[PDB]
């Protein structure tokens, strides 16, 4: 006898949105006060030529650069204080659920409720996101325990593509029969690793958690068939953050700007757009899908201008907003979670049989495609 | 025609051992000078009963606690300096290969050379270990690029069980046909996250990298059949390290002792031994193996006292030294890599058909079993 590979579905999704938002106007007001304060405080070093003066930001600059209008944050006060310019997040006892696991648990509970099946049915938890709150014990195991789940759990990180890589992984796990269902969580406190003092990036990151339940198709009721997945990585330093455990072996570097998100945005725009467009069209052809026939695309949620170009190349025409979803206006860039927020929030109106594409892309470089069909 | 799950093999492994060791004698000399200096500096507090004096360590204490006699380290001087008591690792340019990736690449090249097949065949790289040097770009993508590989790559972390969880993940990837071969790397700079001032743990961690290539059995020449894997996690705070990206949002905590490895070692010993023993025996029964018939066991490599009890329980008699492999005497505890070092270094005098067990266990809690058979 041979065990056959089981096709998979996305059976449910969940979303946790933090209650507090920072509008571009609020972000820019604090940033510009910071700029003025900094330039005055450092005027002698600036005039000596030791450092460049800082430049003010504007809401028009942000909206033109990215389409972002606001972002949600877990901890607002420090982000809008020119003397702080970062989250203030006091540590919790080991006895308490961590802030990052708590977000994952809330999104997962929504997915579990929608799914409606006994949670004992979940055999793996994947915590797939751009930054774990600690190395060990794994976030996914903390989440597994808080949800009362059996089985196994682990953390995986490919930054902006963690949710599409996580869906692929989940599909292979249920495909091989070792589990009947997999819970993926994508908790993102991106405000925790953004440099709010950097004009080139201070508007980019926001916070959220998403979740998805993947199960084999022969047991699923409704949901979305996973028609196929494709994953690609190609090393680049154009999106990088050097913070991590070996900084303790060089504490003199710990407060350098490279210990937060650094993006060379012009290069990312030039290189990632054709990488992704080509990958989508190649993958569609491999699996016999006409990319021109897609009903909806849920692309990565970082830069509307990149999505416009990728979407146009995939569809062969200027995509409508309905068919090329944008949630980065409200959420800004949430790294791994963005394409999943778009999918979760913008799918109810489609017809049985409609084809969609979940596609993530960003740091690594990484990119992932998941073609789906409404059941 | 149906799509069958393709069985997997471990086709090759690789190992990188740092050139420098810290013997127990060297470790204890530095630790005891740190202790003597502390007691002198704090003499009035000690004499007032405000604190207890620190107690010296000894090679006898270390060997009794663990079986460890030495460890390899990537950066020795600070570990033997009683005023530093940590690695000193200057930062590299983004243009250079990172220290953690470099170790993985060296182990991977050994695996690739032993494998003898074109590296173009590798479709995925998994960097599976207890601590990533960066959140992004992923370590695995840096390793992929350095090795000149195509495909995709991502980082995954379940601490001490990352290598068995990675083997399971690789086998499911191969099994589903999306790739023909997977490279796993387990680079561990555990000296980077140990508290060398803590008497109960200063001797525990060392440094290494391992690698393995997993491929479909249909195309494999020799190697080891993966007969079955089983993964389990069960949340515990008895091994924990709170360092991570949100520490910058609470700087008061950033250098506290909880930002390095903290273990409640007696609780771990008492809880993890029966968890693992029962798991191994139950898994063996599930897949029709009599564990009393195993030719060799390659268990986790942290504490010889735990290995003795688990090995005796599994085999149903006292294992010989050759039957229950010990490499922790030389390497100390390398977290994820330990069981793979044992497997890589000690698979001599085994015949086609012989059964073996690779089993990891530790922080999470996590445990993984991989039953193998010599081809």
Automatic annotation (TrEMBL), chains A, B:
MF (Gene Ontology): 3-oxoacyl-[acyl-carrier-protein] synthase activity
Gene3D superfamilies the UniProt entry points to: 3.40.47.10
PANTHER family: 3-OXOACYL-[ACYL-CARRIER-PROTEIN] SYNTHASE 3 (PTHR34069), BETA-KETOACYL-[ACYL-CARRIER-PROTEIN] SYNTHASE III (PTHR34069:SF2)
NCBIfam families referenced in this protein's UniProt entry, alphabetically: PRK07515.1 (NF005703)
Name of protein: 3-oxoacyl-acyl carrier protein synthase III
Domain Beta-ketoacyl-[acyl-carrier-protein] synthase III N-terminal positions: 154-233
Pfam entry (one): ACP_syn_III
Biological process according to GO: fatty acid biosynthetic process; secondary metabolite biosynthetic process
Domain (Beta-ketoacyl-[acyl-carrier-protein] synthase III C-terminal): residue spans on this chain: 286-373
Top-rank taxon: Bacteria
UniProt EC number: 2.3.1.41
Species, as recorded: Rhodopseudomonas palustris (strain ATCC BAA-98 / CGA009)
Keywords: Acyltransferase, Transferase
């Amino acid at each position: 006898y041979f065990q056959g590979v089981r096709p998979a579905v996305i059976a449910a999704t969940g979303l946790y949105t933090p209650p507090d938002s920072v509008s571009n106007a609020e972000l820019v007001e604090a940033f510009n006060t910071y700029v003025a304060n900094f330039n005055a405080a450092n005027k002698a070093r600036i005039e000596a030529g030791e450092i460049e003066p800082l430049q003010p930001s504007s809401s028009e600059f942000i909206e033109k650069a990215s389409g972002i209008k606001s972002r949600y944050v877990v901890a607002k006060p420090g982000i809008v204080d020119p003397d702080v310019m970062r989250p203030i997040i006091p540590e919790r006892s080991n006895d308490e659920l961590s802030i990052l696991a708590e977000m994952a648990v809330t999104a997962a509970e929504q997915a579990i409720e929608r799914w409606g099946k006994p949670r004992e049915r979940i055999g793996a938890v994947l915590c797939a996101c751009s930054n774990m709150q600690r190395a060990y014990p794994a976030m996914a195991i903390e989440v597994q325990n808080a949800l009362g789940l059996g089985g196994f759990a682990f953390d995986m990180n490919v930054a902006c593509s963690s949710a599409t890589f996580g869906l692929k992984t989940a599909a292979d796990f249920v495909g091989g029969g070792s589990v009947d269902a997999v819970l993926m969580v994508n908790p993102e406190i991106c405000s925790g690793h953004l440099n709010f003092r950097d004009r080139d990036s201070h508007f980019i990151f926001g916070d959220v958690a998403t979740a998805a339940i993947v199960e084999r198709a022969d047991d699923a009721q409704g949901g979305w068939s996973i028609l196929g997945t494709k994953l690609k990585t190609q090393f680049s330093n154009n999106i990088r953050n050097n913070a991590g455990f070996l900084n303790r072996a060089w504490p003199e570097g710990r407060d350098k700007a490279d210990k937060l998100f650094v993006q060379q945005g012009r290069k990312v725009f030039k290189e990632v757009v054709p990488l992704v467009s080509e990958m989508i069209i190649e993958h569609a052809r491999e699996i016999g899908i006409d990319p021109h026939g897609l009903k909806r695309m849920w692309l990565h949620q970082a830069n509307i201008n990149m999505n416009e170009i990728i979407g146009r190349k995939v569809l062969g025409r200027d995509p409508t907003r309905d068919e090329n979803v944008i949630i980065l206006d409200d959420y800004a860039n949430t790294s791994s979670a963005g394409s999943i927020i778009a999918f979760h929030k913008h799918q109810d109106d489609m017809a049985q049989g409609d084809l969609g594409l979940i596609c993530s892309f960003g740091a690594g470089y990484s990119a992932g495609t998941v073609f789906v069909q409404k059941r």
